[PDB]
Design a protein around this ligand. Structure first.
Ligand code: A33
Ligand code: A33
Lengths: 255, 255
């Protein structure tokens, strides 16, 4: 099949799960193999934040200094003294793959163990968060620390975005933030036909991991949730986004 | 494999889909082949009913005559001279597979063709109501009148019992009626381990059709959605409920 080809063509390993929520038509390809989830754990993080705070609640004055920053801070670097509220960090984590927002947010929710135990509670026995950013990308092959599967990660995304795990308000926020991500214009979004709406969170990590997790709406129907993950066998290996775009089109077509 | 062994052991074609609504792990087998659906449609019919009617609405007295009665009305034949409320006809419909009850309910929602359109609305592009009881069961092979599939019956059952297509009080009510069905102790019920709660809705048509659809809940863990359909090649063929129960055993093990 066309997924096996793309893996040869790109010298890379792919993981796919998509679900037509309106038909329970699926599309699977290594759906339970582990990949370092990378920055995609960011959506699920905000997933549990929103689960602990009303829309009203998410305006908390939260502060941080120069030292709290880490290795890539496109938004948090503008607002040292300024300070940013949960909303705006959730915006930054989600819209710009801000490493520091993720970290500061993660403290709010009580560290990677809590995240884990919360992920345990909704029904994800797979996603294994252990560390903050950037270290969390430090994943060697066969380790489970900070990995999940395509299945696990769509399902967690679905539960937050589209199930009863979140009230209307809080959920339209997630969808929104994600609908307007800046980072995935060459991932999932480049693989769906002109003018279907897309909410996505992307990731990159060592061993050439490039990941995208999305809900995507046609013009007519129920949304497809989907994770597309990939990796390579060289630690310092580089990724091709066009791996994901392509994968997605094979997903769309199949559905 | 496992399912095809059953198919040859019992000399019947099998239609199985199942979704672990916590993991999206699935069991499928001919999940998109079409079967005459028989009384299984009864649960979707009450799903639709509950979409349109309030609870107090369910107190209305429907009267009927010995003429309004068909060829298997185990409760409705006993109340011709006093009528029954809609609540009482739902019950009788669901728990005893009461045909007249279906025919009067089917009639309260706009007849087969309004039953199609509501099922199109939720996203069931497969299920195809056309007739009332008992003529709906008169389906020859090739025919798509009065057929649906495992993926579609199951998805549809899910929509009503679990999703957002009804409010929670109405879920609970559909679920309760379905938890107390009298007619399937020997099928899905008979194929799951002790302490697994089942709400299910059997059926049987010609060509030896024997179906069962259910939400089934383990002691701890998320609900599992479950259609098991079956048919055979000869038209006057008897069914065996051992087929549907042994097949469920395969689902529970696989799952
Ligand atoms: N921000 C990145 C990945 C990440 O930092 O998790 C850019 C990259 O590192 O290639 C993205 O495109 O999501
Ligand atoms: N209503 C039936 C089958 C049907 O008409 O769909 C009666 C029977 O078992 O013969 C049922 O009880 O499931």
């Amino acid at each position: 099949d066309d997924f096996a080809k793309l893996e040869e063509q790109f010298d890379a390993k792919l993981g796919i799960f998509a679900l037509d929520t309106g038909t329970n038509r699926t599309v699977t390809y290594r759906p339970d193999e582990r990949f370092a989830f990378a920055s995609t754990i960011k959506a699920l993080t905000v997933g549990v934040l929103l689960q602990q705070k009303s829309i009203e609640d998410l305006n908390q004055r939260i502060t941080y200094t120069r030292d709290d920053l880490v290795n890539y801070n496109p938004i948090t670097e503008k607002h040292v003294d300024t300070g940013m509220t949960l909303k705006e960090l959730a915006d930054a984590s989600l819209r710009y793959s801000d490493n520091t927002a993720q970290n500061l947010i993660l403290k709010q929710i009580g560290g990677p163990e809590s995240l884990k135990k919360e992920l345990r509670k909704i029904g994800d026995e797979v996603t294994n968060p252990e560390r903050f950013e950037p270290e969390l990308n430090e994943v060697n092959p066969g380790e489970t620390q900070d990995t999940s599967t395509a299945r696990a990660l769509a399902t967690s995304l679905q539960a937050f975005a589209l199930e009863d795990k979140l009230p209307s308000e809080k959920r339209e926020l997630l969808i929104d933030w994600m609908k307007r991500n800046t980072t995935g214009d060459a991932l999932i979004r480049a693989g769906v036909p002109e003018g279907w709406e897309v909410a996505d969170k992307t990731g990159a990590g060592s061993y050439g991991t490039r990941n995208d997790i999305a809900i995507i709406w046609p013009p007519k129907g129920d949304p497809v949730v989907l994770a597309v993950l990939s990796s390579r066998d060289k630690k310092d290996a580089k990724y091709d986004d066009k791996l994901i775009a392509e994968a997605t089109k094979v997903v769309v077509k199949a559905l």
